[PDB]
Design a protein around this ligand. Structure first.
Ligand SMILES: Cc1cc2nc3c(=O)[nH]c(=O)nc-3n(C[C@H](O)[C@H](O)[C@H](O)COP(=O)(O)OP(=O)(O)OC[C@H]3O[C@@H](n4cnc5c(N)ncnc54)[C@H](O)[C@@H]3O)c2cc1C
Ligand SMILES: Cc1cc2nc3c(=O)[nH]c(=O)nc-3n(C[C@H](O)[C@H](O)[C@H](O)COP(=O)(O)OP(=O)(O)OC[C@H]3O[C@@H](n4cnc5c(N)ncnc54)[C@H](O)[C@@H]3O)c2cc1C
Ligand SMILES: NC(=O)c1ccc[n+]([C@@H]2O[C@H](COP(=O)([O-])OP(=O)(O)OC[C@H]3O[C@@H](n4cnc5c(N)ncnc54)[C@H](OP(=O)(O)O)[C@@H]3O)[C@@H](O)[C@H]2O)c1
Ligand SMILES: NC(=O)c1ccc[n+]([C@@H]2O[C@H](COP(=O)([O-])OP(=O)(O)OC[C@H]3O[C@@H](n4cnc5c(N)ncnc54)[C@H](OP(=O)(O)O)[C@@H]3O)[C@@H](O)[C@H]2O)c1
Lengths: 445, 445
């Protein structure tokens, strides 16, 4: 029978397995499915490890999450359409669950699906090549359990290896002589480390917002965040200041583009990540900016130069869990023959160009959110993934945006209408800035 | 013509280039030589970078050296037999030159050789395979300058990729909740970070000795080092204590196997490295312990399962620079046909077994030094590499060992007999504990 290789067992790869199992249950014949995962367990970025740099096996650490991390968007906007929060936890929980709770949720669905047997853990993929003569991909992987590398042929490869794990780490004058901690968000683990310290946070996006917030919450003396384009612009706490571009450090003195100066004890680089695939040749390797319209992906999933190769979750993310579902169902259907891809590369390239032009038509944030909503709507209309109230999820994000603009430090103290019932979520039992306990234990009581 | 791929432009790979150049100058026909180097420049571990974890390109950071690092053995034991220190710096320097100074010496030699043109920088090797039908290795590499991967065929591969860069990072109960910095020696950079802190150093070998010493020299409050087998046993300074095995951490409380306890601010894991090759299949991938007799390498260099593949510098090291040379000349001669390898695998395996048994015949430190000395002597006898006074090199290591046993903190304040003259080296212009300046500028005046 045909065989499919899935690279990664994060939310996207897990969605892919769930998709195939769902189709199998309906009586459709499915190909063999083999999922290769570098880590010892599934969950992708939702794993936590104290390790940074390289893991116990010597592979680059995938994890970018830190202690005390909570959902940074409304949970109502990421609910699986086929596995409700209610079905999983039994009851209704708050709108911003901590890391451990969302991991439990992700895990519940694939536990129910009985798809763990398709996964090979501690098995980083080393290489993928395609042979036009045989029409097969050869996947080379290393099993760290046995310390043995092997190769096998597949009819399709679906890459779900994430794009928020290989850091963008710029050099600025003085970085190499600074008497202090300099760490990228990727390797940041414990905000308690910076208690009583003056912290410099470089960047102006999600990681800068939240890591600055963690350092503040866990007692940093002061936060200085610097941008190079547009300021985050929120009304910050009294000990937090936003500066324009960093020019250089001299000793522990940071010099900014406006000529202002500031002594800092540590520097956290929240400068984002790159799309990076250490395991792919030129003819299969996705090269793209991080944005809502991903380069070279037909329908945002099928690699234009070889549409037997697919990619999941490579877009920048407003929507997440249910977007990955929409993609995985779509990719499944393409492989199963429920969807037929163009045999015209020009048509595939035009599809991408339209997506890019439409994304660029406006720089408005609500426009961006609606753009991705439109994408999820597009995909879901084209498979048997259950229709769901995308407009509502959209509204959730809109309200969330307003809540952050109002109070950057208290936006997690809010509730949103479930997309299934339309009922607001319970208020959590402890204000976020007071919620020091990470555990799923403390969260659910 | 035939072609040889050299993986790595550290001391070993550089020695290999030098070896081929020396033969070409004598009128011997040499194969084409292509050297792949992941870093932007040559030098191997001797390159310094402030970066830890992954480099600017997204590749694992090779560098394990830190700020303030000086040569840990007497320079007289690591002189090139074809390029005296005298010839390089013109004059005579001390016996423990800082990193920057030894890098300059390393570079001096290869500059003279005009071998840089054989090197491709920013070009990590991704994979190497061998095809028995064609009798060629296929080497796949990624050029980060152009973001393009390519493949090419070679008649031989010489792997000089180091073995002190992929860390051994053990988990101990409590590591994941410790409120403090936990770094492996590999990512350790600036001792100033631990000034006024209580540091736990885990390990009992070279890195533990020297990193503990740097932390001490740069103002750590206290140093606690722990061993799991044989204690380092030196007379430590008043703020440095040596403890038995770590059991667990609870909060910032370290518990040791003798039941004692110590609160610490940071933990530096000097737990060594593994031999790790992310780019090799089973049938080419060296698997060995770190020791003086390396598994599966005939004469310590030719891979017993495919003797057209060679490895350099994979032994643990008392000797370093001139051992790499001896190996490089020997490998070169095998490739050129000046040396003919056995066609009998059993004989190759027996060579390795003899080396292992002989290494293990005594656990005495001077016996170990003499053992590797004997290895270098063996290799040098078998090529036109210039004989040099190996016995003298030994005597240097012998005196160095005595000096360390005498005063662990002041052994770098000593001199040794130039292997060429027999004249002792001059004393450095500043005692080690006082030389706070890394610069080659200060050292050379
Ligand atoms: C710090 C951070 C916080 C976030 N917080 C939120 C949040 O609160 N809410 C939200 O909705 N979204 C959040 N996101 C977005 C996040 O990307 C998604 O929630 C989700 O983790 C993406 O799933 P994925 O499977 O597409 O990628 P990943 O989760 O990165 O999964 C990739 C998987 O592929 C594996 N892999 C990688 N390379 C290889 C290889 N060579 N061989 C084999 N396996 C490999 C990895 O081990 C990993 O498990 C966050 C992202 C980051 C970086
Ligand atoms: C912290 C530390 C301090 C030391 N101090 C001393 C000292 O004072 N004196 C002394 O004599 N010895 C010292 N040593 C021993 C040291 O190993 C040798 O001096 C020397 O650096 C070894 O040379 P090498 O080329 O064999 O390995 P390395 O120097 O590690 O060279 C390996 C090279 O291969 C490259 N490479 C690796 N993987 C790939 C890939 N996939 N593709 C392409 N290129 C790759 C790397 O970029 C690197 O440049 C020290 C070692 C360490 C770890
Ligand atoms: N759950 C949570 O609380 C949480 C926490 C952290 C992250 N995350 C997730 O992680 C994902 C990644 O977000 P991210 O913010 O880390 O990456 P990102 O969204 O790509 O943002 C990167 C930021 O770094 C800046 N930057 C890039 N290169 C720079 C340079 N050389 N010098 C100075 N600044 C530079 C960019 O500014 P320019 O625009 O000027 O280039 C940009 O603002 C997000 O989707 C987010 O949802 C979640
Ligand atoms: N000043 C300098 O120039 C300098 C500084 C640092 C390093 N170096 C070089 O770097 C090289 C590497 O030396 P290294 O000492 O880092 O590595 P190493 O020589 O292999 O020593 C590793 C040490 O870690 C201990 N260890 C390993 N696993 C452990 C675990 N799970 N728990 C506790 N302890 C554990 C080992 O103890 P056991 O014996 O019990 O296994 C061993 O003593 C050396 O050749 C040295 O020359 C040079």
């Amino acid at each position: 029978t045909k065989r499919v290789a899935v690279i990664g067992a994060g939310p996207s790869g897990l969605a892919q397995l769930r998709a195939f199992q769902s189709a199998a249950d309906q009586g459709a014949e499915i190909p063999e499915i083999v999922c290769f995962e570098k880590q010892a367990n599934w969950g992708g970025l939702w794993n936590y490890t104290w390790r940074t740099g390289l893991d116990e096996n010597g592979e680059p650490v995938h994890c970018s999450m830190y202690r005390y991390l909570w959902s940074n968007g409304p949970k109502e906007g990421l609910e699986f359409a086929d596995y409700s929060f209610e079905e999983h936890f039994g009851k209704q929980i708050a709108s911003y669950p901590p890391r451990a709770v969302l991991f439990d949720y992700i895990e519940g669905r694939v536990h129910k699906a009985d798809v763990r047997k398709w996964i090979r853990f501690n098995s980083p993929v080393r290489w993928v090549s395609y042979d036009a003569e045989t029409a097969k991909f050869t996947v080379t992987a290393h099993n760290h359990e046995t310390d043995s590398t092997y190769s096998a042929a597949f009819d399709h490869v679906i890459c779900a290896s994430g794009h928020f794990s290989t850091p963008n780490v710029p050099f600025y004058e003085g970085f190499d002589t600074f008497n202090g901690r300099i760490v990228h968000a990727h390797d940041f683990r414990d905000a308690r480390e910076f208690e009583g310290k003056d912290v410099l946070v470089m960047g102006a996006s999600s990681s800068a917002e939240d890591i600055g917030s963690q350092c503040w919450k866990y007692g940093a003396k002061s936060i200085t965040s610097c941008y190079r384009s547009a300021p985050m612009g929120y009304a910050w706490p009294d000990n937090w200041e936003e500066k324009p571009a960093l020019e250089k450090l001299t000793g522990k003195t940071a010099h900014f583009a406006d000529g202002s100066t500031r002594d800092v004890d540590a520097i956290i680089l929240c400068t984002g990540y790159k799309h990076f695939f250490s395991f792919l040749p030129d003819d299969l390797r996705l090269k793209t900016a991080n944005r809502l319209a991903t380069a070279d992906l037909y329908k945002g999933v099928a690699y234009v130069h070889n549409p037997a190769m697919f990619y999941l979750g490579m877009q920048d993310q407003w929507f997440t869990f249910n977007m990955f579902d929409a993609q995985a169902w779509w990719v499944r259907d393409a492989i199963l023959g429920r969807i037929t891809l163009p045999k015209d590369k020009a048509a595939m390239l035009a599809d991408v160009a339209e997506r890019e032009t439409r994304e660029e038509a406006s720089d408005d944030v609500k426009y961006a959110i609606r753009y991705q909503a439109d994408y999820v709507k597009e995909l879901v209309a084209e498979t048997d993934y259950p229709s769901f109230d995308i407009d509502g999820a959209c509204d959730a994000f809109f309200e969330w945006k307003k809540h952050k603009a109002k109070d950057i430090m208290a936006f997690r103290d809010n509730s949103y209408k479930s997309v299934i019932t339309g009922t607001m979520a319970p208020v959590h039992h402890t204000p976020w800035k007071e919620a020091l306990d990470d555990s799923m234990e403390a969260y659910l009581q």
